Amino acid sequence: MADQLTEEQIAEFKEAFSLFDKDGDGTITTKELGTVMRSLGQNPTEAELQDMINEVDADGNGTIDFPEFLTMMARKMKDTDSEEEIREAFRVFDKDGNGYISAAELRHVMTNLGEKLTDEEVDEMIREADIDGDGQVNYEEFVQMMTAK
Amino acid sequence: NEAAPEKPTSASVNRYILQLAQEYCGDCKNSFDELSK
Amino acid sequence: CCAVDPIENEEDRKKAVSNINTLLDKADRVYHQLMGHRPQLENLLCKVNEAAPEKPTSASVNRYILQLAQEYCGDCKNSFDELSK
Amino acid sequence: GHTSSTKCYGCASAVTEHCITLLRALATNPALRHILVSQGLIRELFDYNLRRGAAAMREEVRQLMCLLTRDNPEATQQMNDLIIGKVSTALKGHWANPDLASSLQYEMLLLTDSISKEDSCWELRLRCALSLFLMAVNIKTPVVVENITLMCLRILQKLIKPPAPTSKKNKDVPVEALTTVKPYCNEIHAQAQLWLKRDPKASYDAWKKCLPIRGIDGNGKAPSKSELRHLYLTEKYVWRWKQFLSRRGKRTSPLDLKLGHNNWLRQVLFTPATQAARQAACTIVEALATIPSRKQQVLDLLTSYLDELSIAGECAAEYLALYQKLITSAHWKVYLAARGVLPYVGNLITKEIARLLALEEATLSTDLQQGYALKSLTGLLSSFVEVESIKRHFKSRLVGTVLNGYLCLRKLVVQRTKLIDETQDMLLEMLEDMT
Amino acid sequence: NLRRGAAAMREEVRQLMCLLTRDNPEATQQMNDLIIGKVSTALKGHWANPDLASSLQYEMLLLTDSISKEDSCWELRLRCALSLFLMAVNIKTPVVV
Amino acid sequence: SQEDQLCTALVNQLNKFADKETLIQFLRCFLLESNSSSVRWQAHCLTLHIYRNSSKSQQELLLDLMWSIWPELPAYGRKAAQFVDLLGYFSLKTPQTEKKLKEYSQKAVEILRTQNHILTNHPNSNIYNTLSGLVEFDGYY
Amino acid sequence: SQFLLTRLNDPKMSETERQSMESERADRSLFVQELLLSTLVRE
Ligand SMILES: [Zn+2]
């Protein structure tokens, strides 16, 4: 799955991992896990970091070595998001599973995020996310929204 | 007011400032006190 | 005149090197002492600029001007002369 | 025998003192405050009584003028307009007359007192202070730096770093633990260019409305794996939705956290006119680096500033003392090493050693600050090296530089000081540690 | 150089500036324009700051020296002096007088 | 606690007997024209306690009397610290209408403006202004 | 000490408003930090 990455990128990832090795065993701790590819020129968020820790550190040891490090990095430079990821985001937005994300579920998710907005603003963003004129976003609308560049 | 630098520590103050102090606080004060009396 | 003993052999060179190191250390100490005066000078400059009237003949001059004269022409001059020597 | 002379200076001065005291007493009533400010009292107190009288009377009129604008935006705007106009008029011809810059101290003192008193019109006074700062931050003349930029930097320093809390509930927690909003990691929503032009869409409340609240973590339960996944992509795609809305709609577009490598920060941090300006700039930049995302850019810019050690030898004493504090942790050192700062420092050391040799060959003049920059750079390299990862990894590329520098320094015979000797000792210790 | 240096250097630069306009109407006009502009700018805010009137002595000394030396551009210097006179003759403040 | 109503009764008696001119003369004689300061402090206390124990109408009458005396302030110079203290306290404590407030503020600002004009055109103003920042002196000789 | 007008400065504040003031100071410090950061961005 990591064959799409050119050899110099593997070399520079090994460079970063080795420089970030503490005890010389080829294994680092997860507290500085952010700093490693954080030092390579990419900019993550804390939710990104905790999700990345969760995905690999299933045993809860909090310690990472090279193969799964390459596993994480191989899924970072991709620009076109995998349709499974977009579909799962659609499902998360579609709490009731009806396939249509009305304003109310959007309000619930935005309040869960901690962000506050007015009813007029969310109605406005919903109506600018609608192409069929029904004022209701669906899977095709979401996909064509995320593919817009 | 011209503040021209002058070349030569209580004696190192500008001579014109010393003259101003002597003329005002030394003589005018005496004259004012006599006049008030 | 400012002159030092001449050098004729190696032990004299060693003595000269040691003496020059000692003189450099003394010069550094005097230099730091001299350059320490500047913050007080700028504080007195800012105070003088306000020109606030003060109530109490050479003693009737403003006290901040007297302090400026004492600090500059009395102490900085001595430090500068020692450093030059 | 109880009547004063008609033309008496002292009696008129005393009447003015009594007038100021009575007006200060009267101003404590809001209605009388409004009537007085409507009479046209601010301009009168600005034009005459600011500079005339004893020092106590001058601070009293400053207090009265501050009080007259306690909660009146129009009065605050009028006072700010007067201050800004006078400062700009003086600063236009500061270059042809130093007194114009040297005779602004009461205006700036009034601004300092106005900002130091917490009131509801703080934003306008902050705008005035920041406008005066950005108008006179690039002037090299020492009188402007001592009389304009210092006061603005002290105002900014007081605003960024508030006093320690005294409430019994918050007697221990630091200032970063009290904010009611959480700034975004990689975005800046405040924009000064629009703010300084009085844009309602770029105000303080508008900025606060765009930031999520700090979640009251009343439950200590560890969120499940699905919860973290949901949080992740919800944040991701909400951000993408907002980005598209800004791209097509009318919502403002936040700026990206990428700092420029040339700025006023470099002017202020190494100014030789005064030291308090450098110290205030150090405090400001230290306060600007709290969340690691901003500390990224702060440390990168400060590393970019590394080449100034030679030009501003002792004036860097503050700057270095901050850099070492910001990289005092191991992971920041190894991050900087990963970005390629070791060859940079080595090249700087070699260049300044070559300059030292070239100067030694030709002339015989003395310099009491010789070797300070080299001493600092070698100490910084040792600081980077002592940690085990970089020492084990970066030894094979730095041996040549260290040995060449040590031999070149040993060649010195006349232009030698204590700093050069200490540098040679540290370089030899480096060589013995690496081999 | 008008305000910096010892008094002898200041009078020397005054003499040099006077000599540079010995028979040049354009140079005389430029010098007069500078003097008039500075005096008017200071006198606009003299009422709110006495130093503005108290810190014009070198400009007026330059004008005095320029007029005191008989040359062919005397009319322009007289015009500058009379304009400054009629601009600041009705002000009661003692510093202006 | 009898002294409270005794003081109230005596204050009402004095207010009943005394007219405007007598109170005006008392103020001018023992708050402004007195060279001593102990007498001025005694008058300050006595005026304050006459004001406190009076009714609203007499309080307004006394405040108006003091605001009528105030324009004569320059003739007394430094001697009117207690007078302006009492005037400020009375104007701050007595509840009063808007027109009276505007009149009072106008009087204060007018006196301030006139004194500023006197200061900035004084023949000796330049000399004193320059001497202030160089020498230390008590009076204007 | 006998002057009445010199005692007019009597500032007092309770505890809840003290927490509110501390939170507001923190918010304003964050705002000025962001505003200063906005001026150093790359152009
Ligand atoms: Zn008098």
mmCIF file with all atom_site columns, N, CA, C and O and ligand atoms in Angstrom, chain D residues 4-5 8-12, ligand 1:
data_model
loop_
_atom_site.group_PDB
_atom_site.id
_atom_site.type_symbol
_atom_site.label_atom_id
_atom_site.label_alt_id
_atom_site.label_comp_id
_atom_site.label_asym_id
_atom_site.label_entity_id
_atom_site.label_seq_id
_atom_site.pdbx_PDB_ins_code
_atom_site.Cartn_x
_atom_site.Cartn_y
_atom_site.Cartn_z
_atom_site.occupancy
_atom_site.B_iso_or_equiv
_atom_site.pdbx_formal_charge
_atom_site.auth_seq_id
_atom_site.auth_comp_id
_atom_site.auth_asym_id
_atom_site.auth_atom_id
_atom_site.pdbx_PDB_model_num
ATOM   1  N  N  . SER D 1 4  ? -6.596 90.347 46.485 1.00 0.00 ? 4  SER D N  1
ATOM   2  C  CA . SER D 1 4  ? -5.421 90.095 45.668 1.00 0.00 ? 4  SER D CA 1
ATOM   3  C  C  . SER D 1 4  ? -5.273 91.149 44.575 1.00 0.00 ? 4  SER D C  1
ATOM   4  O  O  . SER D 1 4  ? -6.235 91.808 44.176 1.00 0.00 ? 4  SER D O  1
ATOM   5  N  N  . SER D 1 5  ? -4.041 91.302 44.095 1.00 0.00 ? 5  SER D N  1
ATOM   6  C  CA . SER D 1 5  ? -3.774 92.177 42.964 1.00 0.00 ? 5  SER D CA 1
ATOM   7  C  C  . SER D 1 5  ? -4.420 91.617 41.702 1.00 0.00 ? 5  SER D C  1
ATOM   8  O  O  . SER D 1 5  ? -4.527 90.400 41.523 1.00 0.00 ? 5  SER D O  1
ATOM   9  N  N  . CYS D 1 8  ? -1.865 89.229 38.967 1.00 0.00 ? 8  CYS D N  1
ATOM   10 C  CA . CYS D 1 8  ? -0.964 88.430 39.783 1.00 0.00 ? 8  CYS D CA 1
ATOM   11 C  C  . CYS D 1 8  ? -0.864 87.036 39.184 1.00 0.00 ? 8  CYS D C  1
ATOM   12 O  O  . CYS D 1 8  ? -1.887 86.396 38.919 1.00 0.00 ? 8  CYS D O  1
ATOM   13 N  N  . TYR D 1 9  ? 0.366  86.572 38.961 1.00 0.00 ? 9  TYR D N  1
ATOM   14 C  CA . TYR D 1 9  ? 0.562  85.265 38.345 1.00 0.00 ? 9  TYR D CA 1
ATOM   15 C  C  . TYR D 1 9  ? 0.187  84.141 39.305 1.00 0.00 ? 9  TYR D C  1
ATOM   16 O  O  . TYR D 1 9  ? -0.538 83.209 38.931 1.00 0.00 ? 9  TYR D O  1
ATOM   17 N  N  . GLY D 1 10 ? 0.665  84.220 40.549 1.00 0.00 ? 10 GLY D N  1
ATOM   18 C  CA . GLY D 1 10 ? 0.411  83.153 41.502 1.00 0.00 ? 10 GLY D CA 1
ATOM   19 C  C  . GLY D 1 10 ? -1.060 82.984 41.819 1.00 0.00 ? 10 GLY D C  1
ATOM   20 O  O  . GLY D 1 10 ? -1.546 81.862 41.975 1.00 0.00 ? 10 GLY D O  1
ATOM   21 N  N  . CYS D 1 11 ? -1.792 84.094 41.909 1.00 0.00 ? 11 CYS D N  1
ATOM   22 C  CA . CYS D 1 11 ? -3.211 84.006 42.231 1.00 0.00 ? 11 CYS D CA 1
ATOM   23 C  C  . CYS D 1 11 ? -3.997 83.361 41.101 1.00 0.00 ? 11 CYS D C  1
ATOM   24 O  O  . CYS D 1 11 ? -4.878 82.532 41.349 1.00 0.00 ? 11 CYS D O  1
ATOM   25 N  N  . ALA D 1 12 ? -3.693 83.724 39.854 1.00 0.00 ? 12 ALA D N  1
ATOM   26 C  CA . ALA D 1 12 ? -4.362 83.090 38.724 1.00 0.00 ? 12 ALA D CA 1
ATOM   27 C  C  . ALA D 1 12 ? -4.013 81.609 38.640 1.00 0.00 ? 12 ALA D C  1
ATOM   28 O  O  . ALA D 1 12 ? -4.873 80.776 38.331 1.00 0.00 ? 12 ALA D O  1
HETATM 29 ZN ZN . ZN  H 2 .  ? -1.410 87.109 44.380 1.00 0.00 ? 1  ZN  H ZN 1
#
